């Protein structure tokens, strides 16, 4: 039968939420707002929060986004955006400035902005090796849509290896899926080949 009170459960949930927020942040006390800037939030932090809110352990993981190296950089002269593949290279020095130690990384997310698809497209993600080789990472069957969508790839192990065993420039190739019948081309359109980035959630060094 009905024997529970709404208000007591609500207030207990509120207090448990307070404890959960203070504990997941490993916060003994709420942060004092004495030394806050006297103005609104910067654009980079707002964009990071928007990307975290976007639709694609226990403690809080610090979130940092690292944009890919711009397509005008020398690195893409060797790897040109062919009809059947696009290349996305990242400066791993920026990744280490974001995540100082490989063990701290909790999840890494390669984020793409697909513009439009009249037909469904099967695409596949590879990572780059030093000897110009590519190892398979994933496969996604993009359904057609009339609106740009944010694509997500789980590359946690790849970025962890890059933080540990990676060079200055390390990247991915997104290519149209090929079979043993014939060859295909990449009909999906992403901005700048904004541009795709890496959303890294890692344990903060202060709470490591």
């Amino acid at each position: 039968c009905k024997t529970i009170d709404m208000e007591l459960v609500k207030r207990k949930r509120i207090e448990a939420i307070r404890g959960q927020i203070l504990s997941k942040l490993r916060l003994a006390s709420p942060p004092s707002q004495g030394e806050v800037p006297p103005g609104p939030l910067p654009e980079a932090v707002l964009a990071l929060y928007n990307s975290t809110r976007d639709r694609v352990d226990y403690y809080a993981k610090e979130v940092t986004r690292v944009l890919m190296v711009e397509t005008h950089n020398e690195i893409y002269d060797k790897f040109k955006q062919s009809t059947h593949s696009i290349y996305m290279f990242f400066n791993t020095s920026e990744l280490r400035e974001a995540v100082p130690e490989p063990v701290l990384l909790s999840r890494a997310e390669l984020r793409l902005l697909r513009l439009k698809l009249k037909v469904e497209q099967h695409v596949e993600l590879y990572q780059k090796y030093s000897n110009n080789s590519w190892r398979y990472l994933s496969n996604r069957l993009l359904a057609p849509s009339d609106s740009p969508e944010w694509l997500s790839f789980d590359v946690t192990g790849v970025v962890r290896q890059w933080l540990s065993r990676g060079g200055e420039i390390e990247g991915f190739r997104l290519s149209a899926h090929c079979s043993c019948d014939s060859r295909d081309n990449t009909l999906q359109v992403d901005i700048n080949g904004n541009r795709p980035f890496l959303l890294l959630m890692a344990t903060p060094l202060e709470r490591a």
Partner: antibody
Amino acid sequence: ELQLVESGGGLVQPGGSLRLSCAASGFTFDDYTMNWVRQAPGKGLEWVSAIRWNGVTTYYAESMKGRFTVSRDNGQNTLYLQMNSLKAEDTAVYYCAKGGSIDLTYGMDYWGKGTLVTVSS
Amino acid sequence: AVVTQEPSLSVSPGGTVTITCGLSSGSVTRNNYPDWYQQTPGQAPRLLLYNTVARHSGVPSRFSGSISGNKAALTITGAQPEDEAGYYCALYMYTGSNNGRVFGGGTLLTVLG
């Protein structure tokens, strides 16, 4: 296999010029950075120069910047270090080193035998 | 900046030895990519370690690398008698007006045979 052979080393007067050549087989210059390193007789290694896969951008030591030039012939599958106006301290065994990747990172995997360049008046 | 490296070391066979290379002005991070090379006197240098931890193909598992404190450390555990050589550390930094590698004065690691 994996082979770098070097040539051009010898004895010159100070202020002269050499054109050290490095011919490779077993891999492709189109995929790898190429480095020149030097080792003075009795002392440690010293990084001299490096050049990426195409050759438009080059890196130098500041004891050598401007005074040395590096170049590649991917068609000829060879690498060149042209040294001009050598001082007395430029005598060394020069090593041609393959790189690990297109960057200046992943280390210098395979090294050549090196040419002993001597400068003496 | 110059890469400071300690001059010479002695390790008993089967022991554990650590070689550290550092910046005179700064701290060695993984962004200052350490490359560890081994040179037998009279022979060409051989890459042992790259990207602070990664072993070159053919290099025994007893060679390992890390960032210890503010320096880059190459650790040899169970030093075989054929590991007596000159050990050099090449750090990737921004010298002068451009990027480049800098070698330190390598350790003349001698195994007490």
